[PDB]
Design a protein around this ligand. Structure first.
Ligand SMILES: Cc1nc(-c2cn3c(n2)-c2ccc(-c4cnn(C(C)(C)C(N)=O)c4)cc2OCC3)n(C(C)C)n1
Lengths: 921, 169
């Protein structure tokens, strides 16, 4: 049914209850409300409708003042159909923003309040001010700078040829075409176009019409992606001149070390424990700093299984209180065991010091997380999150009590007091050897720790892992060095963000070395930096500050920061931490917050649309389902929601108008929607909304192919790759970019055959380009897939462009999940050789490409290891341990020398060429 | 003079046959666990949804409670000022309108009541899932450990990878 019985509460106490349409906007509902109110009592005392604002409880259980009344009721989605009239009162901006933030992040801000946590509250306080400060600061800045914030340049990482370009102005039918070289600076192009018949060109910027992409700054024409892209294909670029004042329009947005007592704890009780009555429950506890232990792990007695087991045991550890480091981590695991007259149930971690540097005391109820049996069946789970389980009413829990160490509370000493204690060849050969490539070796490194600082600055990580963090004297001495350690390259800092290095002083040094990062480079690692937040102990940290810093300085960064965080708000273990960051970003980015909302609603309608299509496919055939899919899209609320928004996959892309006849789905496993767009200002973009399946694995893969493409492009090797967009947006929900003019190899063969297909798409002269496009790309993807260990390759998951470019999709299995061999396909080799039996001149070039490609990836081998090492945080099944990282080590052959590497690669290559013929028969 | 008795069978085929049995049993239990773990996560997501839905019922009711408070304060003088200058109509319309508001609250309280019954019932399930997962773990871990011991035993005896694979996959 189309209508809803809505309850209306008037501010005279009077109550009305009449039906309205779900499609009706709030402004219309008010008119109808006032017409009905006439004939109800106390109407003479109301003001006009403009004096009042509707209020409702939205889907996040929060009150929302509905200030925009052009919005439809079905779009508001109140919990129950209940609207209350209230005064158009007070600071409506703050209230309106908080409501929109709650809806946007998919967590009500009140839930943060509900926790009654100082840490949460201090974070929200500090960061929201910090982000609001940046926002206000940003506003004052000029159009040039604001353009660089809003729409930062997209450049390629070199000949001097000449091809024409179309330039026009805003709100004008007439457009000018004229000649221009590849190596011109954009200022010169504007100056030329500005000669309209016979203003000044410095008060202008060139826009790529149809998309939010601008051309400006001290850079040549060909370094821009749009120009580079069009010049490769040969097409005329279509730019548009935009005035400086027109940009200002967009800009409109508004004591411990004395305590030599051994450390101990009181294990009181368990709660809501679900287990076999025959077994008996035990709790094992252990202290940790990072991965490594601080002392031996104690245990409890065998108490019999029940929901509410009681222990009341003084668990005393083999370590003093003064010995405990800053990031000391008490770690519980509850086990069900046989009496003996094992099953890990759950686990819980706990920081011994709190966020204000205070050693915790008194009762803590730790809400445990369930243990999942993995291959490495460890006693405890020290890598697991410190954050409590949010399922507090139903989840199991452990009640403990840290005893009172002293009458007055104790804090961990300040930097000044750490530096106080910190101040207090045959060795040169032995040390070098160890660091040039272990209980004996650790003590050597430790003794010579000052020589490491002076002569082996990059070996800082090693020195930290050799430090005895259980001894507090040692910890002082190591920090002393660290606070005057020389600044390391980005590559070293990336290693230092890993869970092995939990100390705040390490992380701070890590971030300090990462500030030299450019936005292009930072973006290349953004996914990894987000995952590392899951290792963080406290909410307020350097890494959050840094990510927010850069997200406010660059809108593209902000965009993908938002989506990475948003897409895991379903995950209990990060929902809180991520929720507070999303809030902070939104407060510092009120403008972009409007764009992200519009996207979220598109994604919400799509889910609902996909659910319908899933259900209909089982009932009815495809044609009727496709027809009924369009009907749902034709609806006013749907069409407007899906139309006119920046693409989540790329915010510079405009998804203007949905082509409903061109929209459909795909018979595939989770029936992904195929949505097609077009814009009359440009320019025919397509997306795939996939829901039910996880897209995180693909994104990572594509990220790494993109990085390879950059690494190769930096050596002057464009291998014509296609690192298409892929972005997880929610729980088992994402968008995939549709690459226009492309099909799978299976389909092209289903219609020898691959070669003929290229003839029809590249007649005469073009065909020579198409082969080169194929070869260059076939090389890059041959290497990429070998390195990353991407198995399961076949005709359905390899596609080819009409341009000639080959590319892979659906990277579900990777890192050999046994070694994937190197793979040359006869059908590809046949194209590479231009149809010939033997064309060794051409095949040698292709061999050269593969070698040069692979060589270059080894030169940046540690970059790949380090990044993957951080992605172990993401909890992907196929990337969860050292073995998965070892795959890359062996596939890039980093242990072997560069000469040894190439000889082995050739042997593999040759056997791939041998195997190519056998497979075909 | 070193011992560790673990493997039951003692010949390369009989052990490899047992490796095929234990691997199949491992993978089937893993599927049982993973299948329940979807139920756990889904039920956890659903239970939280029900919990915020209850907070929504609270915050709605709270709005109706505020409406009643207002109705009572606001209406006092009007009913008295219409008693004198005898408009008995306007008094009865107000009170009936108020009685209609009070009547609507009781429906929302019933609707809240039902959702609390669901969350109570689904909390019982959540625990039942978690109980079943914890009875499966020891078997699942024993099957992983056994499987690996047989693999190691056959690897020691020098059995080729080809023979190991056809027993596993
Ligand atoms: C995990 C995953 N990844 C993908 C995936 C990733 N891509 C595509 N699918 C993809 C699919 C079709 C197209 C395409 C373009 N034109 N045409 C047609 C109509 C044939 C044409 N030539 O007239 C098809 C382009 C594509 O873009 C590349 C990236 N899928 C899917 C299995 C759901 N699943």
């Amino acid at each position: 049914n189309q209508s809803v019985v809505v309850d209306f509460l008037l501010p005279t106490g009077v109550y009305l209850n009449f039906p309205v349409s779900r499609n009706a906007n709030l402004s219309t509902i008010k008119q109808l409300l006032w017409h009905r109110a006439q004939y109800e009592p106390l109407f003479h005392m109301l003001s006009g409708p403009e004096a009042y604002v509707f209020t409702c409880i939205n889907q996040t259980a929060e009150q929302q003042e509905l200030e925009d009344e052009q919005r439809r009721l079905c779009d508001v989605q109140p919990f129950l159909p209940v609207l209350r009239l209230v005064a158009r009162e007070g600071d409506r901006v703050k209230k309106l923003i908080n409501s929109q933030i709650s809806l946007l992040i998919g967590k009500g801000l009140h839930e943060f309040d509900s926790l009654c946590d100082p840490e949460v509250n201090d974070f929200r306080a500090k960061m929201c001010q910090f982000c609001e400060e940046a926002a206000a600061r940003r506003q004052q800045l000029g159009w040039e700078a604001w353009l660089q914030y809003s729409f930062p340049l997209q450049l390629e990482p070199l000949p001097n040829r000449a091809l024409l370009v179309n330039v026009k102005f805003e709100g004008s039918e007439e457009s000018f075409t004229f000649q221009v070289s590849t190596k011109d600076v954009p200022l010169a192009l504007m100056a030329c176009a500005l000669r309209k018949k016979a203003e000044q060109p410095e008060d202008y910027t060139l826009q790529v019409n149809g998309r939010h992409e601008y051309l400006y700054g001290s850079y040549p024409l060909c370094q821009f992606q749009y120009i580079c892209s069009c010049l490769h294909s040969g097409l005329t670029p279509h730019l548009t001149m935009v005035h400086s004042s027109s940009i200002l329009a967009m800009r409109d947005e508004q004591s411990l070390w004395s305590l030599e007592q051994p450390f101990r704890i009181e294990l009181i009780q368990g709660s809501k424990v679900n287990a076999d009555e025959r077994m008996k429950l035990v709790v094992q506890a252990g202290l940790f700093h990072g991965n490594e232990m601080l002392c031996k792990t104690v245990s409890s007695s065998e108490v019999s299984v029940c929901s509410e087991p009681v222990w009341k045991q003084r668990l005393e550890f083999d370590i003093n209180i003064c010995d405990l480091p800053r990031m000391a981590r008490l770690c519980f695991a509850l086990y069900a065991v046989i009496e003996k007259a094992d099953c890990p149930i759950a686990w819980a971690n706990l920081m011994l010091f709190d966020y204000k540097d205070q050693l915790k005391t008194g009762e803590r109820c730790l809400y445990m997380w369930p243990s999942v049996p993995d291959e490495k069946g460890e006693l405890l789970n020290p890598t697991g999150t410190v954050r409590s389980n949010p399922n507090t009413d139903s989840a199991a829990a452990l009640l403990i009590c840290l005893p009172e160490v002293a009458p007055h509370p104790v804090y961990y000493p300040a930097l000044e007091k750490i530096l106080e204690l910190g101040r207090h060849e045959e060795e040169q050969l032995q040390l070098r050897e160890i660091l040039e490539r272990y209980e004996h070796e650790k003590d050597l490194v430790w003794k010579l720790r000052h020589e490491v600082q002076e002569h082996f600055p990059e070996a800082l990580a090693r020195l930290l892992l050799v430090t005895k963090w259980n001894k507090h004297e040692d910890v002082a001495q190591m920090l002393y060095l660290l606070c005057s350690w020389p600044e390391l390259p980005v590559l070293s800092a990336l290693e230092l963000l890993d869970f092995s290095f939990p100390d705040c002083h390490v992380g701070s040094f890590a971030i300090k070395s990462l500030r030299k990062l450019t936005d292009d480079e930072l973006f290349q690692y953004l996914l990894q930096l987000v995952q590392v937040l899951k290792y963080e102990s406290y909410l307020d940290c350097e890494l959050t500050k840094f990510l927010l810093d850069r997200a406010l300085a660059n809108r593209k960064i902000g965009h993908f920061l938002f989506w990475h965080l948003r897409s895991e708000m379903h995950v209990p273990s990060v929902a809180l931490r991520f929720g507070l960051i999303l809030e902070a970003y939104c407060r510092g980015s009120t403008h972009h917050m409007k764009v992200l909302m519009k996207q979220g609603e598109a994604l919400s309608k799509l889910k609902a649309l996909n659910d319908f299509v899933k259900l209909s496919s089982q009932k009815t055939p495809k044609p009727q389902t496709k027809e009924l899919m369009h009907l749902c899209m034709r609806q006013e609320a749907y069409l407007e929601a899906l139309s006119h928004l920046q693409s989540p996959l790329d915010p510079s892309t405009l998804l203007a108008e949905v082509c409903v006849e061109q929209c459909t789905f795909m018979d595939s496993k989770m029936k992904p929607l195929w949505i097609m767009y077009s814009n009359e200002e440009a320019g025919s973009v397509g997306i795939i909304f996939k829901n039910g399946d996880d897209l995180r694995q693909d994104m990572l893969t594509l990220q790494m192919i993109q990085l390879m493409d950059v690494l190769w492009k930096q050596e002057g090797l464009d291998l014509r790759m296609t690192p298409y967009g892929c972005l997880p947006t929610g729980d088992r929900t994402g968008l995939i970019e549709v690459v226009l003019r492309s099909d799978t190899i299976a389909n092209i063969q289903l219609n020898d055959a691959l070669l003929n297909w290229l003839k029809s798409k590249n007649p005469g002269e073009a065909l020579d380009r198409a082969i080169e496009e194929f070869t260059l790309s076939c090389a890059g993807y041959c290497v990429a897939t070998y390195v990353l260990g991407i198995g399961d390759r076949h005709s359905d998951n390899i596609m080819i462009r009409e341009s000639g470019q080959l590319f892979h999709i659906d990277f579900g299995h990777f890192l050999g999940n046994e070694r994937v061999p190197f793979i040359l396909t006869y059908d590809f080799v046949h194209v590479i050789q231009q149809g010939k039996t033997n064309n060794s001149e051409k095949f040698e070039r292709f061999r050269g490409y593969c070698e040069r490609a692979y060589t270059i990836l080894r030169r940046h081998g540690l970059l790949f290891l380090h990044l993957f090492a951080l992605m172990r945080a993401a909890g992907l099944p196929e990337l969860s341990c050292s073995k998965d990282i070892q795959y890359l080590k062996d596939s890039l052959a980093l242990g072997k020398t560069e000469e040894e590497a190439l000889k082995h690669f050739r042997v593999k290559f040759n056997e791939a060429l041998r195997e190519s013929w056998k497979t075909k028969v | 003079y070193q011992q560790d008795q673990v493997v039951k069978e003692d010949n390369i085929e009989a052990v490899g046959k047992k490796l095929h049995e234990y691997n199949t049993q491992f993978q089937e239990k893993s599927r049982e666990y993973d299948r329940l773990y979807e139920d756990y996560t889904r039920t956890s997501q659903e239970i939280q949804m029900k919990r915020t839905a209850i907070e929504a019922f609270n915050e709605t009711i709270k709005i109706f409670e505020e409406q009643c408070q207002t109705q009572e304060r606001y209406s006092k003088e009007y009913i008295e000022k219409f008693k004198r200058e005898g408009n008995e109509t306007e008094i009865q319309r107000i009170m009936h309108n108020y009685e209609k508001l009070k009547s609507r609250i009781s429906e929302i309280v019933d609707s809240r009541r039902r959702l609390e019954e669901d969350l109570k019932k689904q909390a019982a399930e959540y625990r039942e899932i978690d109980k079943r997962m914890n009875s499966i773990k020891p078997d699942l871990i024993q099957l992983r450990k056994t499987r690996d011991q047989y693999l190691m035993w056959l690897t020691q005896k020098g059995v080729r990878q080809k023979k190991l694979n056809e027993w596993l996959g």
